[PDB]
């Protein structure tokens, strides 16, 4: 039965955990907005091989996932959960948190995302051969950017994307339920202080994040068919563990 003071402290703690495990500082991200890939550089990426483009993207996603694991490790109550549940939560949610986190690196003015040093549009990713997935990812980020999240709101929202008591396989279910509820209280408390509670009805329906992760696993099945050795030899082992079927 968390007090209002304990809830306020939870807001601060989560926001701190997030800031500390942010890959990119928001100021650096902003100071690079006009730094956009040229026609020539975009052509360079489009001309790359499928295997090369996948290998690069797999590396970047894995790096992002590493930061999310660190976020979990610093998140109030997460490390108090049993080993099984920490794993169940991360397996189901790490990619979802990365997808939400991406909106920090997404400039909605020109529909570009910070990728390998500059801002590129989704046409940079053509060689992947998964345009519906890539475009779905860009649309998700765009729809999120329409909410104009603050760093604090992202911190709280991602905590909730991760701490989901309905993940199949949890063993201390009531313990996860309690953490999710307190995080919901913290989120709703922070929103009301800023009169931003209206965003809640505008958050992505959970099916959306699920369809994105599912598309990624499917497109990887197809890539792996075409290039079985690349995955074993070149892809980060964590990536392989989390996404290969």
């Amino acid at each position: 039965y968390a007090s209002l003071t304990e809830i306020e402290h939870l807001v601060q703690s989560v926001c701190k955990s997030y800031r500390e495990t942010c890959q990119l500082r928001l100021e650096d991200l902003l100071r690079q907005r006009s730094n956009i890939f040229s026609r020539e550089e975009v052509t360079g990426y489009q001309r790359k091989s499928m295997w090369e483009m996948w290998e690069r993207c797999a590396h970047h996603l894995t790096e992002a996932i590493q930061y999310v694991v660190e976020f979990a490790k610093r998140l109030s109550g997460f490390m108090e959960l049993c080993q099984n549940d920490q794993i169940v939560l991360l397996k189901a949610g790490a990619m979802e948190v990365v997808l939400v986190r991406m909106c920090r690196a997404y400039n909605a003015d020109n529909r570009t995302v910070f990728f390998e040093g500059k801002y590129g549009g989704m046409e940079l990713f053509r060689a992947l051969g998964c345009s519906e997935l890539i475009s779905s990812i860009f649309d998700f980020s765009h729809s999120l950017s329409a909410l104009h999240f603050s760093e604090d709101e992202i911190a709280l929202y991602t905590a909730l994307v991760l701490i989901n008591a309905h993940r199949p396989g949890l063993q201390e279910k009531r313990k996860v339920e309690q953490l999710q509820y307190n995080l919901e209280l913290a989120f709703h408390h922070h929103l009301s202080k800023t009169h931003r509670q209206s965003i809640l009805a505008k958050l992505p329906p959970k099916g959306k994040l699920r369809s994105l992760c599912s598309q990624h696993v499917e497109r990887l099945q197809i890539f792996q068919h075409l290039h079985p050795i690349v995955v074993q030899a070149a892809f980060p082992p964590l990536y392989k563990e989390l996404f290969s079927t």
Partner: peptide
């Protein structure tokens, strides 16, 4: 698993 090791288990 790798997740376990990363969690410090």
């Amino acid at each position: 698993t790798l997740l376990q090791l990363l969690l410090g288990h």
